[PDB]
């Protein structure tokens, strides 16, 4: 196959989607073919659509999903509200495995943090990563609490031998400030910080997003992903 | 020895300090001798003092500190900013073991979440709980993200064989509302919810704090903590 990375996070709304876009954009600019899978999208009544964000910010066209729940809740509660079950583990795993091919960077986004339920019954993004042998990129904050959440997420990955490909600070404040500066230095002590996306990047137009994306990651690390 | 519980949380500001004071108050009203312990305190320059609050809300007088730092930062960064070192792991252990006593409940509040560095080098409250054979009471929010953080914390506890004495919801709103209510239902499927402390417990007076405390926990669970 090619390279598969789940893009998880220490929590909800930490920047997972804008980080998928940013890495997709840098990979494409490096001449790598990119696909992005978001198996379960919720909050569609208010128009949440993470694949649309990736398609618009980074230009990706191979964008796969399996389910769309209208309520703005976590996948299991939204599915409980709708009275319609989440997809099954095999559905999600085979979708990603069908996307993966040599020369392709395939990114997978779940919902919220690493352990929220993505498929019936109780299967997580960590389970999916195991079944498709993906490594994990962990999107973090630089705010109070991040080191604990980062360490807890990194331990949960190592507990099932899911490799950690790096950290990304999904939203880097301007100018950093005292906590954010201390938090970035300490995260850098426990894993490589691949990038720190400036705050508000997800509202850039595609041209600005691409230039920002190619400057945010290290040219060689992106080139070597596939 | 007696019974030692580390009181940790899914993060900082989730209610660890008010849960200590509530468990201490309920334990005391059952006849149980209580000590409370905070080996690392940051933010002294902003007035933060969890031991002092626990004394205020609950009337506990057996309160033991050790490391104190001016800045409201994570311990490592606060001690660094003050030209000080973190305490060594044996000093934290000594603090707790000196208080342990038969028939006494000792509560050890961390700083922030389970894996925050409390001692050189990379030593956490989980390591400390291992050293004193303590179980762990996990203070959680009912807000969004709580399920994932709670599951991550419980897994980190089990990997080191640190028994989990249950969850407590640090701040519980009246009325609940849909987000909190759903999360509390989902937390109870994960582990035992020992209490849900009403929002604003920390402002109650000693009389009302004791009433709230006695109502918040099952008395038979409180009494069963301590032989
Ligand atoms: C203003 C705002 C933007 N966004 C946008 C900007 C972020 O950089 C981007 C990616 O963050 P995500 O972590 O993916 O936030 P999300 O709601 O899409 O996360 P999840 O898929 O788990 O629900 O989404 C939010 O998610 N939440 C917000 O409150
Ligand atoms: C915002 C605020 C909260 N509190 C209360 C609300 C919480 O339920 C309680 C305990 O939260 P904790 O989890 O103990 O967090 P903390 O702020 O004490 O910091 P630390 O991680 O070092 O413990 O403190 C106050 O007493 N005064 C305040 O101004
Ligand atoms: Mg998203
Ligand atoms: Mg506290």
How far apart CA A194 and CA A118 sit, in angstroms, is 26
Question: Does the N-terminal peptide bond of residue B172 adopt cis geometry, omega within 30 degrees of 0?
Answer: no
How far apart CA A78 and CA A91 sit, in angstroms, is 19
Is B50 marked as binding a ligand? yes
Nearest by CB: B159 against A77, A114, A159: A159
Residues 6+ apart with CB under 8 A from B193: B166, B167, B168, B169, B184, B187
> Does ligand 1 have an atom closer than 6 angstroms to the CB of A50?
yes
Q: Identify which of B166, B163, B39, B57 has the alpha carbon closest to the alpha carbon of residue B109.
A: B39
Element (H, E) at A208: helix A206-216
Neighbours of A159 (CB within 10 A): 13
Residues 6+ apart with CB under 8 A from B35: B60, B62, B63, B64, B99, B101, B104, B105, B106, B107
How far apart CA B10 and CA A49 sit, in angstroms, is 29
How far apart CA B161 and CA B71 sit, in angstroms, is 33
Q: Identify which of A165, A160, A112, A156 has the alpha carbon closest to the alpha carbon of residue A136.
A: A165
Q: What is the largest CA-CA distance in chain A?
A: 47
Q: Identify which of B2, B12, B3 has the alpha carbon closest to the alpha carbon of residue B139.
A: B12
> Does ligand 2 have an atom closer than 6 angstroms to the CB of B16?
yes
E-assigned strand segments in B141-198 = 164-172, 193-198
Q: Identify which of A144, A160, A121, A120 has the alpha carbon closest to the alpha carbon of residue A8.
A: A160
> Does ligand 2 have an atom closer than 6 angstroms to the CB of B171?
yes
Q: What is residue B59's three-state secondary structure?
A: coil
Tokens at B186, concatenated: 């989902």
Q: What angle do CA B82, B83, B86 make, to 5 degrees?
A: 85
DSSP secondary-structure letter at B45?
Answer: G
Question: B207-223 as b/e, with b when 16 or more CB fall inside 10 Å?
Answer: eebbebbbebbeeeebe
Active-site residues of A, by number, are 38
How far apart CA A148 and CA A150 sit, in angstroms, is 5
Ligand at minimal distance from the CA of B203 is: 2
Domains of chain B, first to last: 1-227 (3.40.50.300)
Q: Identify which of A217, A213, A183 has the alpha carbon closest to the alpha carbon of residue A59.
A: A213
Q: What angle do CA A161, B165, B91 make, to 5 degrees?
A: 80
Strands across the sheet containing A135-140:
A62-64, A33-37, A104-109, A3-9, A135-140, A164-172, A193-198
In contact, A40 and A110? CB cutoff 8 Å: yes
Element (H, E) at A222: helix A219-223
Q: Which residue of A has its CA nearest to B12?
A: A145
Q: What is the tally of helices (H) and strands (E) in chain B?
A: 9, 7
How far apart CA A12 and CA A181 sit, in angstroms, is 22
Dihedral angle sign, alpha carbons of residues B192, B15, A169, B180: positive
B75, B124, B152, B162: best to mutate for the A interface, most A CBs within 10 A: B152
How many Å separate Cα A213 from the centre of its chain? 15
Nearest CA to ligand 2 atom 25: B202
Neighbours of A135 (CB within 10 A): 16
Nearest by CB: B147 against A116, A149, A178: A116
In contact, A168 and B169? CB cutoff 8 Å: no
Query: Strands A123-124 and B104-109, how do they pair?
Result: unpaired
Q: Identify which of A142, A226, A218 has the alpha carbon closest to the alpha carbon of residue A180.
A: A142
Residues 6+ apart with CB under 8 A from A12: A111, A112, A113, B144, B145, B148
Q: Give how far Cα B195 sits from Cα of A52, A102, B142, Å.
A: 42, 53, 12
| Experimental technique for the deposited model | X-ray
Helix A178-190, helix A146-158: angle, nearest 10: 20
Q: Identify which of B150, B10, B144 has the alpha carbon closest to the alpha carbon of residue A73.
A: B144
Tokens at B16, concatenated: 């660890």
* Chain A neighbors of B114, CB-CB under 8 A: 148, 152
Q: Identify which of A100, A106, A84 has the alpha carbon closest to the alpha carbon of residue A40.
A: A84
- Ligand 1 centroid to Cα of residue A218, in Å, is 24
Element (H, E) at A8: strand A3-9
Q: Give how far Cα A92 sits from Cα of A64, A89, A98, A109, A127, Å.
A: 10, 6, 10, 11, 11
Ligand at minimal distance from the CA of B168 is: 2
Q: What are phi and psi of A4, to 5 degrees?
A: -120, 130
Q: Does A160 touch chain B (CB under 8 A)?
A: no
Q: Which long-range contacts (CB under 8 A, 24 or more apart) does A117-123 make?
A: A117/A74, A117/A75, A117/A76, A117/A86, A118/A39, A118/A40, A118/A75, A118/A86, A118/A92, A119/A39, A119/A40, A119/A86, A119/A87, A119/A88, A119/A89, A119/A91, A119/A92, A120/A85, A120/A86, A120/A87, A120/A88, A120/A89, A123/A89, A123/A92
Length reported for chain A: 226
> Does ligand 2 have an atom closer than 6 angstroms to the CB of B114?
no
E-assigned strand segments in chain B = 3-9, 33-41, 63-68, 104-109, 135-140, 164-172, 193-198
Q: Does B7 touch chain A (CB under 8 A)?
A: no
Residues 6+ apart with CB under 8 A from A180: A142, A143, A172, A173
Residues 6+ apart with CB under 8 A from B182: A73, A77
Q: Does A149 touch chain B (CB under 8 A)?
A: yes
* Chain B neighbors of A114, CB-CB under 8 A: 148, 152
Q: Does A112 touch chain B (CB under 8 A)?
A: yes
Element (H, E) at A68: strand A67-69
How far apart CA A211 and CA A26 sit, in angstroms, is 9
How far apart CA B155 and CA A63 sit, in angstroms, is 33
Q: Which of B46, B51, B202, B213 to mutate to test the pocket of ligand 2 (most atoms within 8 A of CB)?
A: B202
Q: Which long-range contacts (CB under 8 A, 24 or more apart) does B207-210 make?
A: B209/B21, B209/B22, B209/B25, B209/B57, B209/B58, B210/B25, B210/B29, B210/B58
Q: Where are the alpha helices (DSSP H) in A104-196?
A: 125-132, 146-158, 178-190
In contact, B40 and B67? CB cutoff 8 Å: yes
How far apart CA A165 and CA A27 sit, in angstroms, is 15
Is B147 marked as binding a ligand? yes
> Does ligand 1 have an atom closer than 6 angstroms to the CB of A127?
no
Place of tokens 């002092």: B52
Q: Give how far Cα B103 sits from Cα of A9, B87, B99, B227, Å.
A: 43, 28, 11, 6
Q: Give how far Cα B147 sits from Cα of A184, A200, B188, Å.
A: 26, 27, 10
Tokens at A87, concatenated: 């997809």
Neighbours of A4 (CB within 10 A): 22
In contact, B154 and A154? CB cutoff 8 Å: no
DSSP secondary-structure letter at B119?
Answer: B
Q: Identify which of B25, B104, B95 has the alpha carbon closest to the alpha carbon of residue B60.
A: B25
> Does ligand 1 have an atom closer than 6 angstroms to the CB of A202?
yes
Q: What is residue B6's three-state secondary structure?
A: strand
How far apart CA B127 and CA B121 sit, in angstroms, is 11
How far apart CA B89 and CA B124 sit, in angstroms, is 9
Q: What distance in Å separates residue B208's CA from the closest CA in chain A?
A: 31
Q: What angle do CA A92, A74, A45 make, to 5 degrees?
A: 95
| β-strand partners of B40 | B67
């Amino acid at each position: 196959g090619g390279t598969i990375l789940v893009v998880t996070g220490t929590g909800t709304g930490v920047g997972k989607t804008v980080v998928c876009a940013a890495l997709a954009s840098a990979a494409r600019q490096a001449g790598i073919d990119v696909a992005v899978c978001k198996p379960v999208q919720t909050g569609t009544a208010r128009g949440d659509d993470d694949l649309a964000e990736v398609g618009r910010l980074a230009g990706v066209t191979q964008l796969a999903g399996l389910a769309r729940y209208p309520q703005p809740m976590a996948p299991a509660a939204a599915a409980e509200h709708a009275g319609m079950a989440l997809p099954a583990r095999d559905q999600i795993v085979r979708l990603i495995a069908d996307l993966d091919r040599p020369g392709r960077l395939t990114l997978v986004e779940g919902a919220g943090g690493l352990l929220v339920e993505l498929a019936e019954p109780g299967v997580t993004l960590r389970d999916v990563a195991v079944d498709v042998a993906a490594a994990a990129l962990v999107v973090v904050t630089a705010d109070l609490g991040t080191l604990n959440h980062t360490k807890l997420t990194l331990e949960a990955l190592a507990a099932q031998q899911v490799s950690c490909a790096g950290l990304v600070i999904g939203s880097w404040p301007d100018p950093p400030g005292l906590v954010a500066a201390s938090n970035r230095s300490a995260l850098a002590r426990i894993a490589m910080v691949r990038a720190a996306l400036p705050a508000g990047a997800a509202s850039l137009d595609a041209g600005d997003f691409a230039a920002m994306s190619a400057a945010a990651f290290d040219r060689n690390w992106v080139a070597g992903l596939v």
